[PDB]
Amino acid sequence: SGFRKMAFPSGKVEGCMVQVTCGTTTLNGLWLDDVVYCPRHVICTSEDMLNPNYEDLLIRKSNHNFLVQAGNVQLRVIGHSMQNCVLKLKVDTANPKTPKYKFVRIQPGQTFSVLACYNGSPSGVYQCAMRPNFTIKGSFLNGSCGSVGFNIDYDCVSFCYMHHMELPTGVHAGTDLEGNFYGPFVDRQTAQAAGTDTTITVNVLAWLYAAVINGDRWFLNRFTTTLNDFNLVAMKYNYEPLTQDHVDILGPLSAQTGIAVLDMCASLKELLQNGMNGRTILGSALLEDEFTPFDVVRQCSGVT
Amino acid sequence: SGFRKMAFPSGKVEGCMVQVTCGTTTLNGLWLDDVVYCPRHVICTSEDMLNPNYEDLLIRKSNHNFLVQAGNVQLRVIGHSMQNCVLKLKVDTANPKTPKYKFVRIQPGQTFSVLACYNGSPSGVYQCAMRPNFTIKGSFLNGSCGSVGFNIDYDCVSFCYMHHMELPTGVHAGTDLEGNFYGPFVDRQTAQAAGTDTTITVNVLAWLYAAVINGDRWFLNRFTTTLNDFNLVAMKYNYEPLTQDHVDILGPLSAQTGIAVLDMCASLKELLQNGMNGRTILGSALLEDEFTPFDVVRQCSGVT
Numbered sequence: 390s391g392f393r394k395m396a397f398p399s400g401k402v403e404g405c406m407v408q409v410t411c412g413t414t415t416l417n418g419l420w421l422d423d424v425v426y427c428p429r430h431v432i433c434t435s436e437d438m439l440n441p442n443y444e445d446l447l448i449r450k451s452n453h454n455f456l457v458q459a460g461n462v463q464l465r466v467i468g469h470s471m472q473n474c475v476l477k478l479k480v481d482t483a484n485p486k487t488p489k490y491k492f493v494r495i496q497p498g499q500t501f502s503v504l505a506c507y508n509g510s511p512s513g514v515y516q517c518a519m520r521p522n523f524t525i526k527g528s529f530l531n532g533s534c535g536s537v538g539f540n541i542d543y544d545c546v547s548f549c550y551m552h553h554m555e556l557p558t559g560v561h562a563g564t565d566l567e568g569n570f571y572g573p574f575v576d577r578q579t580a581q582a583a584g585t586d587t588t589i590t591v592n593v594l595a596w597l598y599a600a601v602i603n604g605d606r607w608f609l610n611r612f613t614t615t616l617n618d619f620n621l622v623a624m625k626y627n628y629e630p631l632t633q634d635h636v637d638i639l640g641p642l643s644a645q646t647g648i649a650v651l652d653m654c655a656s657l658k659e660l661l662q663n664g665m666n667g668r669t670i671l672g673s674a675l676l677e678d679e680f681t682p683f684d685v686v687r688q689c690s691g692v693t
Numbered sequence: 694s695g696f697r698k699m700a701f702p703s704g705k706v707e708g709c710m711v712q713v714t715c716g717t718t719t720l721n722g723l724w725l726d727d728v729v730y731c732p733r734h735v736i737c738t739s740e741d742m743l744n745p746n747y748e749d750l751l752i753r754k755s756n757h758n759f760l761v762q763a764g765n766v767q768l769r770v771i772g773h774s775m776q777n778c779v780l781k782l783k784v785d786t787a788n789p790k791t792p793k794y795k796f797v798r799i800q801p802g803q804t805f806s807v808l809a810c811y812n813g814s815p816s817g818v819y820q821c822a823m824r825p826n827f828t829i830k831g832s833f834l835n836g837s838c839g840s841v842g843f844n845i846d847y848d849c850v851s852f853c854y855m856h857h858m859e860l861p862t863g864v865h866a867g868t869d870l871e872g873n874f875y876g877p878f879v880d881r882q883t884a885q886a887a888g889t890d891t892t893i894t895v896n897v898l899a900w901l902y903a904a905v906i907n908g909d910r911w912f913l914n915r916f917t918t919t920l921n922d923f924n925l926v927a928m929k930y931n932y933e934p935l936t937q938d939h940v941d942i943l944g945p946l947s948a949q950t951g952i953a954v955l956d957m958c959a960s961l962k963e964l965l966q967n968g969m970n971g972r973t974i975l976g977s978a979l980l981e982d983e984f985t986p987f988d989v990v991r992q993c994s995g996v997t
């Protein structure tokens with residue numbers, strides 16, 4: 390029992406972190422097989438960030454201008470290429486610690502773990518979600534660029550995020566491992582504002598199921614609702630609309646607890662309308678939306 | 694910017710997790726050098742837990758009754774001993790992945806990361822604190838026993854907790870790595886109730902400093918207070934008394950923000966008396982107490 394914001398064990402990803410330096414800029418790289426992936430803005434100075442022409446800046450760089458250090462040993466760079474907003478640096482040595490891996494592009498609402506790194510060294514691990522506005526609410530300082538987000542399925546690491554930028558609002562933007570940004574963000578120091586950060590409804594419901602499983606049941610009411618009636622309330626509270634696909638995904642949690650998905654929707658509707666009244670659910674005074682239904686099942690079943 | 698409940702990278706500890714089985718009971722063990730540490734209740738059946746005589750039960754066990762598996766390979770047990778509530782199983786092979794380590798007994802209010810494990814395999818990592826009532830609010834299922842709590846200082850892992858038990862209230866109890874329980878808990882399935890779970894005041898103040906550093910400043914007021922006046926309020930709200938030692942420990946955060954510790958105490962006093970009024974601090978609607986002043990500095994400075 391108990392329910393925590395749990396991250397995946399980070400060891401498999403720690404074995405891939407390297408430091409990449411180009412000129413005077415240093416950030417993190419991800420070493421998988423004989424390729425090091427890193428944000429393309431490793432070639433920029435702080436002044437270049439205001440209006441960078443990456444293709445033009447990259448012409449002035451050769452393989453020997455990219456310094457890659459793994460632990461305390463230098464890797465030899467034998468090739469370089471730009472794919473969207475990431476650089477792929479071919480090295481002469483395959484990472485001996487390369488885990489089984491995939492590159493995946495996640496959908497908004499999906500969660501992942503982040504291994505925050507500085508100078509190719511891991512500082513910490515935390516769990517977050519891709520927000521509906523395609524930002525992440527991370528914890529990143531200068532030099533954290535190139536830190537990655539991932540999920541693990543038994544022994545396969547699915548890398549889904551590489552950190553690139555902090556917006557003026559303190560929220561974070563980045564790319565998948567093919568270098569495509571999540572959302573409309575561009576790798577330039579210009580006015581980029583995030584859209585509405587709505588609440589991931591299907592995740593809130595999963596966390597309410599997690600609360601019932603772990604004994605917190607005060608919020609369960611005598612009501613039910615319909616998808617359309619619930620969604621009228623969800624729109625009013627800046628919650629994402631719930632679809633039948635989300636109801637289907639909550640099926641296992643509904644079966645485990647014996648609480649129909651629409652009855653849980655009616656409990657959530659009352660919590661939105663009445664508030665918490667100073668009470669807590671799973672030690673929180675807000676409705677938590679960074680646990681997917683898959684996360685709740687995984688944590689409540691002990692998947693390793 | 695951004696502030697997350699961050700755990701230490703778990704790789705160094707994942708390299709130490711093994712499975713220990715005795716008879717029909719299986720739990721986790723921690724393999725460091727040529728010794729495997731695990732809860733002594735690995736020798737008990739579910740029926741033995743009601744009233745166990747560990748010394749008597751251990752007489753019926755020989756080295757070959759303890760099965761230790763690391764990954765998928767079996768370790769040879771060449772000795773066994775009981776130290777307080779843990780068993781130390783001497784194996785014939787030193788763990789090649791043994792990190793630099795220390796065994797430390799933490800004080801209430803101190804935080805650590807937990808690598809939750811099942812069958813010697815890591816499931817996840819999360820951050821928690823030793824509560825003032827010597828319980829931890831973890832996320833542990835049956836078979837998680839022997840999972841460990843730790844802190845990392847550059848390359849040295851200080852192990853501080855080994856999981857043993859879940860109380861009927863859903864909170865957790867365990868030992869240090871010498872087998873001594875934190876608090877008054879005993880490894881027996883009997884009525885053990887936890888004492889008052891008070892709020893770790895010095896941690897709340899550190900997290901308020903973290904909020905100011907990260908831009909959340911609405912709660913700062915025009916007031917100051919004294920240690921004695923603040924403590925009258927803290928006692929009323931089940932907060933731990935703040936001492937001059939705690940004020941000293943908040944010195945670096947006070948210097949970074951320019952906010953005197955007693956002025957932050959006055960802001961916290963007003964938050965306790967007035968509540969949040971539906972507002973949030975660092976995305977929380979409650980005052981967070983599982984970040985120490987050291988954690989706030991570490992996260993806000995990027996220590997690797």
Ligand SMILES: C[C@@]1(C(=O)Nc2cncc3ccccc23)CCOc2ccc(Cl)cc21
Pocket residue numbers: 430438529530531532533534553554555556575576577578579694
């Ligand atoms: C490199 C830089 C940045 O956001 N980096 C950072 C990333 N994370 C946390 C940060 C905390 C504090 C300071 C910078 C942070 C700064 C200049 O403007 C830009 C513009 C675009 C891009 Cl793709 C990166 C950047």
Ligand SMILES: C[C@@]1(C(=O)Nc2cncc3ccccc23)CCOc2ccc(Cl)cc21
Pocket residue numbers: 390734742833834835836837838857858859860879880881882883
């Ligand atoms: C072994 C056992 C236990 O608490 N273990 C567990 C530890 N963590 C999470 C649990 C979640 C669900 C089921 C059990 C959990 C059960 C019997 O009573 C006792 C009594 C004493 C001790 Cl030292 C251990 C135990």
